[PDB]
Design an enzyme around this catalytic site. Structure first.
Site, mmCIF file in Angstrom:
data_model
loop_
_atom_site.group_PDB
_atom_site.id
_atom_site.type_symbol
_atom_site.label_atom_id
_atom_site.label_comp_id
_atom_site.label_asym_id
_atom_site.label_seq_id
_atom_site.Cartn_x
_atom_site.Cartn_y
_atom_site.Cartn_z
ATOM 1 N N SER A 46 0.528 -1.173 -0.037
ATOM 2 C CA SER A 46 0.072 0.101 -0.006
ATOM 3 C C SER A 46 0.751 1.254 0.047
ATOM 4 O O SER A 46 0.245 2.235 -0.224
ATOM 5 C CB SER A 46 -0.894 -0.017 1.284
ATOM 6 O OG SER A 46 -1.901 -1.064 1.380
ATOM 7 N N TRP A 81 -10.670 -4.058 2.478
ATOM 8 C CA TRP A 81 -10.082 -2.967 3.146
ATOM 9 C C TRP A 81 -10.309 -1.522 2.321
ATOM 10 O O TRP A 81 -9.511 -0.964 1.721
ATOM 11 C CB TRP A 81 -8.723 -3.252 3.211
ATOM 12 C CG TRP A 81 -7.990 -2.171 4.181
ATOM 13 C CD1 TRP A 81 -7.665 -0.977 3.967
ATOM 14 C CD2 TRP A 81 -7.493 -2.406 5.582
ATOM 15 N NE1 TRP A 81 -7.101 -0.291 5.031
ATOM 16 C CE2 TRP A 81 -7.081 -1.036 6.153
ATOM 17 C CE3 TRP A 81 -7.732 -3.497 6.481
ATOM 18 C CZ2 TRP A 81 -6.578 -1.203 7.569
ATOM 19 C CZ3 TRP A 81 -7.331 -3.345 7.731
ATOM 20 C CH2 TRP A 81 -6.734 -2.323 8.241
ATOM 21 N N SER A 106 -5.022 3.821 3.882
ATOM 22 C CA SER A 106 -4.813 2.712 2.697
ATOM 23 C C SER A 106 -5.999 2.213 1.918
ATOM 24 O O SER A 106 -6.022 1.208 1.632
ATOM 25 C CB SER A 106 -3.967 1.707 3.231
ATOM 26 O OG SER A 106 -2.688 2.281 3.687
ATOM 27 N N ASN A 108 -8.456 0.797 -0.381
ATOM 28 C CA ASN A 108 -8.252 0.169 -1.788
ATOM 29 C C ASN A 108 -9.136 0.449 -2.880
ATOM 30 O O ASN A 108 -8.451 0.691 -3.886
ATOM 31 C CB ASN A 108 -8.251 -1.539 -1.483
ATOM 32 C CG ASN A 108 -7.124 -1.955 -1.045
ATOM 33 O OD1 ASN A 108 -5.809 -1.538 -1.293
ATOM 34 N ND2 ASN A 108 -6.962 -3.148 0.036
ATOM 35 N N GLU A 144 -4.281 -7.371 -6.498
ATOM 36 C CA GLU A 144 -3.112 -8.374 -7.137
ATOM 37 C C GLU A 144 -1.605 -7.915 -7.035
ATOM 38 O O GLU A 144 -0.895 -8.583 -6.750
ATOM 39 C CB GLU A 144 -3.343 -8.644 -8.595
ATOM 40 C CG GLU A 144 -4.677 -9.433 -8.973
ATOM 41 C CD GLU A 144 -6.107 -8.737 -8.791
ATOM 42 O OE1 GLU A 144 -5.991 -7.623 -9.037
ATOM 43 O OE2 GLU A 144 -6.904 -9.358 -9.120
ATOM 44 N N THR A 211 2.454 3.896 5.001
ATOM 45 C CA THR A 211 2.553 2.379 5.469
ATOM 46 C C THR A 211 1.876 1.562 4.156
ATOM 47 O O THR A 211 1.402 2.044 3.295
ATOM 48 C CB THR A 211 1.814 1.841 6.439
ATOM 49 O OG1 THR A 211 0.348 2.148 6.349
ATOM 50 C CG2 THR A 211 2.382 2.793 7.866
ATOM 51 N N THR A 213 1.167 -3.114 3.973
ATOM 52 C CA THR A 213 1.116 -4.358 4.319
ATOM 53 C C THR A 213 0.778 -5.311 3.639
ATOM 54 O O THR A 213 -0.346 -5.059 3.054
ATOM 55 C CB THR A 213 0.310 -4.240 5.720
ATOM 56 O OG1 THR A 213 0.724 -3.445 6.586
ATOM 57 C CG2 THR A 213 0.496 -5.679 6.223
HETATM 58 B B1 LIG Z 1 -1.897 -2.295 2.013
HETATM 59 O O1 LIG Z 1 -0.873 -3.033 1.300
HETATM 60 O O2 LIG Z 1 -1.744 -1.963 3.254
HETATM 61 C C1 LIG Z 1 -2.837 -1.391 3.860
HETATM 62 C C2 LIG Z 1 -2.185 -1.321 5.302
HETATM 63 C C3 LIG Z 1 -1.151 -0.286 5.769
HETATM 64 O O3 LIG Z 1 -1.020 0.562 4.984
HETATM 65 O O4 LIG Z 1 -0.159 -0.920 6.327
HETATM 66 C C4 LIG Z 1 -4.018 -2.178 3.831
HETATM 67 C C5 LIG Z 1 -4.400 -2.325 2.502
HETATM 68 C C6 LIG Z 1 -3.329 -2.939 1.643
HETATM 69 N N1 LIG Z 1 -3.393 -4.374 1.868
HETATM 70 C C7 LIG Z 1 -4.163 -5.379 1.800
HETATM 71 O O5 LIG Z 1 -5.135 -4.981 0.877
HETATM 72 C C8 LIG Z 1 -4.029 -6.673 2.327
HETATM 73 C C9 LIG Z 1 -3.981 -6.449 3.893
HETATM 74 C C10 LIG Z 1 -3.015 -6.815 4.690
HETATM 75 C C11 LIG Z 1 -3.433 -6.588 6.212
HETATM 76 C C12 LIG Z 1 -4.796 -5.981 6.259
HETATM 77 S S1 LIG Z 1 -5.362 -5.666 4.413
#
Ligand SMILES: *[B@@]1([O])O[C]([C]C([O])=O)[C][C][C]1[N]C(=O)[C]C1=[C][C]=[C]S1
EC number: 3.5.2.6
Length: 270
Positions: A46, A81, A106, A108, A144, A211, A213
């Site tokens: 993200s 998310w 973050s 999506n 993806e 950030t 994740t």
């Molecule tokens: B993204 O890569 O990261 C976000 C969290 C952050 O900013 O650290 C969450 C949305 C995206 N990640 C995902 O869609 C997969 C996930 C991993 C943990 C929660 S959602």
């Protein structure tokens, strides 16, 4: 000359984590740097959404009124998310609101809507090329792009290129002055990073961060601009990955690497 003047135990930290940590930190006053695995590729996850918002701001310099444009979207635009855009599904949001949601939560769905505005992953990559970043690549859309496959260069950059581009956008001339401050303000309002670089930064310093994740391969990250009082700002990036798909990410490891980076730069902190 000014790189790694003071060695820090990054190797022990990544070994305890069970993976790889990539760090690049730049003292914008002296030019001194801390660098560890800084030219290796790590998945953006993200964290690409910060650069996405900067690319939108850059486009708004030539398209006045872009930020105010209302964007309606269907339920099919929601992605797991999407904590802000799901609350405005029945109303729509402006481009600026989508950008803030992408940076600060973050979001999506917001990220995919904004990527469509820029012409997709190649459009964001083109913006990064336009500011001199030859390392960044975005290849796919949410979700993806989160696959974080070991050895896969898709949807990756390096800690060094992330930091260099972040400096150009927040402190340099890559954005016009009003857009630059808006980008900084969005980063300062981020809500997702309290346990990462911010946990290494004293509460009386200003800080903006973004950030990421991925959810697999122990892959998570954070980049930030930090304004320690009484000295020039610091720009830094901390990226992690790990060899196994089910390896857990660690926020504490990101905070600890940020602490080591500040210590390596001689920045008195916590
Ligand atoms: B993204 O890569 O990261 C976000 C969290 C952050 O900013 O650290 C969450 C949305 C995206 N990640 C995902 O869609 C997969 C996930 C991993 C943990 C929660 S959602």
């Amino acid at each position: 000359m000014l790189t790694n003047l003071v060695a820090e135990p990054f190797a022990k930290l990544e070994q305890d984590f069970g993976g790889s940590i990539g760090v690049y930190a730049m003292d914008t006053g002296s030019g001194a740097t801390v660098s560890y695995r800084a030219e290796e590729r790590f998945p953006l996850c993200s964290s690409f959404k910060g650069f996405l918002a900067a690319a939108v701001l850059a486009r708004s310099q030539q398209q006045a009124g872009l930020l105010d444009t209302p964007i309606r979207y269907g339920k099919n635009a929601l992605v797991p998310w999407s904590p802000i855009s799901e609350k405005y599904l029945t109303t729509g949001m402006t481009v600026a609101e989508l950008s803030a949601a992408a940076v600060q939560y973050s979001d999506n769905a917001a990220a995919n809507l904004l990527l469509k505005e820029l012409g997709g992953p190649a459009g964001l990559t083109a913006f990064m090329r336009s500011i001199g970043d030859t390392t960044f690549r975005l290849d796919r859309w949410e979700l993806e792009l989160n696959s974080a496959i070991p050895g896969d260069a898709r949807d990756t950059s390096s800690p060094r290129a992330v930091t260099e581009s972040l400096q150009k956008l927040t402190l340099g001339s890559a954005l016009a002055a009003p857009q630059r401050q808006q980008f900084v303000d969005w980063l300062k309002g981020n809500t997702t990073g309290n346990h990462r670089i911010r946990a290494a930064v004293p509460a009386d310093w200003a800080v903006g961060d973004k950030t990421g994740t991925c959810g697999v391969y122990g892959t998570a990250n954070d980049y930030a601009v930090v304004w320690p009082t009484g000295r020039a700002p610091i720009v830094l990036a901390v990226y992690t990955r790990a060899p196994n798909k089910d390896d857990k990410h660690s926020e504490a490891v990101i905070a600890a690497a940020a602490r080591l980076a500040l210590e390596g730069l001689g920045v008195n902190g916590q």
